[PDB]
């Protein structure tokens, strides 16, 4: 009886601890990703492509070359992302989506707030958060094809919404894709460098930023996430051996 009790518990225990081992061979081989972006940023369109190819919380699961990915989207009404952003200190990367064409547009007339400046304000708070000082951010400048339409003299929006743009010249290391006008390149790399200014100053060797000129319809967005997650893990191991 009481002898059998410990024999009942240790057998009950041995069932508990074996299964916890099998669940430890899945949590370690899984890369968890958090999506932080505005509602009108194409983030939902990006989620749709990543899921079909393979109410406070939303999940999805896609495998890229036998590598497990688990992506979480958090629809939040409160301006304070805090008190639920702490739960993502152990994610492998944060995929930050920004609508690049959304310059000169305001957020439902709410404070006539520019949607691009709102994205920069959101990015700065997440990039300078104490709980996410080791998590890297995969930045997606999404609405590129819509950005090209306005830049080529649409309504003469010369980005005069962003004044320093008149003092901008495209850097020589910028890689222009064929079929792209030189005026588009002046706009794209201005918007990207607006974000890279935030990431460069705050933290080094703890967490990086990987900008991309994606599009909502692009199928390479899955591949950009995979390549960036590979580089994030590699940079972590090289730091473990103090090789970086």
């Amino acid at each position: 009886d009481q002898r059998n009790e410990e024999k009942a518990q240790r057998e009950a225990n041995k069932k508990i601890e074996k299964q916890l081992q099998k669940d430890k061979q899945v949590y370690r081989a899984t890369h968890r990703l958090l999506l932080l972006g505005a509602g009108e940023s194409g983030k939902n369109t990006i989620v749709k492509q990543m899921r079909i190819l393979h109410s406070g919380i939303f999940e999805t699961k896609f495998q890229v070359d036998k590598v497990n990915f688990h992506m979480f989207d958090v629809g939040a009404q409160r301006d304070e992302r805090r008190k639920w952003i702490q739960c993502f200190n152990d994610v492998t990367a944060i995929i930050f989506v920004v609508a690049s064409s959304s310059y000169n547009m305001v957020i439902r007339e709410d404070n006539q707030t520019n949607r691009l400046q709102a994205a920069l304000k959101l990015f700065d708070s997440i990039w300078n958060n104490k709980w996410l000082r080791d998590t890297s951010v995969i930045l997606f400048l999404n609405k590129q094809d819509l950005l090209a339409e306005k830049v080529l003299a649409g309504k003469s929006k010369i980005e005069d919404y962003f004044p320093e743009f008149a003092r901008y010249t495209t850097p020589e290391d910028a890689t222009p894709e064929p079929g792209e006008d030189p005026r588009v390149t002046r706009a794209k790399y201005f918007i990207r460098d607006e974000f890279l200014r935030i990431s460069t100053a705050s933290g080094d060797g703890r967490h990086y930023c990987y900008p991309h000129f994606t599009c909502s319809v692009d199928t390479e967005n899955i591949r950009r996430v995979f390549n960036d997650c590979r580089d994030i893990i590699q940079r972590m191991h090289l730091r473990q051996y103090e090789l970086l």
């Binding site: 081989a29 590979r230 590699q234 191991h237 090789l243």
Partner: protein, 393 residues
């Protein structure tokens, strides 16, 4: 430089063999009242006439036999049928002496200095590595798969140093570098004894295990940086097997082929056949694979460094530091030492060539312990953590 007391003793061995055969099968002299022939550890005196000098050619095992091919050594047997007792009977060996050593430090006085240096190096490596193993096993937070591999590498280094200690202490050659004729019989009966062979075999195995654990370090780091996912238990056991029991696949066959076709000696490279291949080939294979892994890892590091926006010369300051601290973990000096080694040398030359590389590679355990435990910023912060808990009290 090419010959020392080693080959003098090995020549005296075969000389003793020839004279033992001669004594056993030389025909007895027809005349009686002879003078018994004998071998007195120095010369090989045949049966001689009574009251007459005995003319014996100077033996051919002495290193200085080149200068005296006409020399002889003398014993006078008496008319009563016995040699001339001085007070070994009277022998005048002045005609075959050795010339003066003109301020030359022979290979023995150099091998002694090399022995001192690499014994000191293994002592420091042993001490630093036992301390580092104590540190890595004490703090429970420092328990990773990479730290288990580091512990196994530390154990391989410690075992190699201990095996070298046991080898050197078992045959106290540190003092016998000036051994006279009467000491060469023990020096030769120890060499062909089983204890010497087993000690040498154990040292060989520890050497191979250390090389294969450096290889396992390289392979594990490569699998991490190759973004490869495998069942870690089923891979940690595989790496343990590769590091410890794969040298058994080419050390016990070498031992068997050196036990079945070797009559004399402490299992040094053979005179005619090529049996050292069973040992040296897989060592070279491991060193080559690990050098390829080193190349791949430094390529990954340079790709990462070039990815960042990094200054021209800060890049090299960090590139040099990453490479320098990566040499002890993989052992990439053992491609230079493997190229500057003569694989066909024997005897004193081979001993000197091994001892210089030992003199330099002794401190590798110390460097590994310092770099991957003592200056490890994780270990330092664990020290700070455990010494702030007494500041609570």
């Amino acid at each position: 430089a090419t010959v020392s007391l080693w080959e003098t003793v090995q020549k005296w061995r075969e000389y003793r063999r020839q004279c033992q055969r001669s004594l056993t099968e030389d025909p007895p002299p027809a005349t009686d009242l002879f003078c018994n022939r004998t071998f007195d550890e120095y010369a090989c005196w045949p049966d001689g006439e009574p009251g007459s000098f005995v003319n014996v050619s100077c033996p051919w095992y002495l290193p200085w036999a080149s200068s005296v091919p006409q020399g002889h050594v003398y014993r006078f047997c008496t008319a009563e049928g016995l040699w001339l007792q001085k007070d070994l009977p009277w022998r005048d060996l002045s005609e075959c002496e050795e010339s003066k050593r003109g301020e030359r430090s022979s290979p023995e006085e150099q091998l002694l200095f090399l022995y001192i240096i690499y014994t000191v190096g293994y002592a420091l490596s042993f001490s630093a590595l036992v301390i580092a193993s104590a540190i890595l096993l004490g703090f429970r937070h420092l328990h990773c798969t990479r730290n288990y591999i580091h512990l196994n590498l530390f154990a391989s280094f410690i075992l190699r140093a201990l095996s070298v200690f046991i080898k050197d202490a078992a045959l106290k050659w540190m003092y016998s570098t000036a051994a006279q004729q009467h000491q060469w019989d023990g020096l030769l009966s120890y060499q062909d004894s089983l204890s010497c062979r087993l000690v040498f075999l154990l040292m060989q195995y520890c050497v191979a295990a250390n090389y294969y654990w450096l290889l396992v370090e390289g392979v594990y780091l490569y699998t991490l940086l190759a973004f490869s996912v495998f069942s870690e238990q089923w891979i940690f056991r595989l790496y343990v097997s590769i590091g410890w029991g794969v040298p058994l696949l080419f050390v016990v066959p070498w031992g068997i082929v050196k036990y079945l076709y070797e009559d004399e000696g402490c299992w040094t490279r053979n005179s005619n056949m090529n049996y050292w291949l069973i040992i040296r080939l897989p060592i070279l294979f491991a060193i080559g694979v690990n050098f390829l892994i080193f190349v791949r890892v430094i390529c990954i590091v340079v790709s990462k460094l070039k990815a960042n926006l990094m200054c021209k010369t800060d890049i090299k300051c960090r590139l040099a530091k990453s490479t320098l601290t990566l040499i002890p973990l993989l052992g990439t000096h053992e491609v230079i030492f493997a190229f500057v080694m003569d694989e066909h040398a024997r005897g004193t030359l081979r001993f000197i060539k091994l001892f210089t590389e030992l003199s330099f590679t002794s401190f590798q355990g110390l460097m590994v312990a310092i770099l991957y435990c003592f200056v490890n910023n994780e270990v330092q912060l664990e020290f700070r953590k455990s010494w702030e808990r007494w500041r609570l009290e």
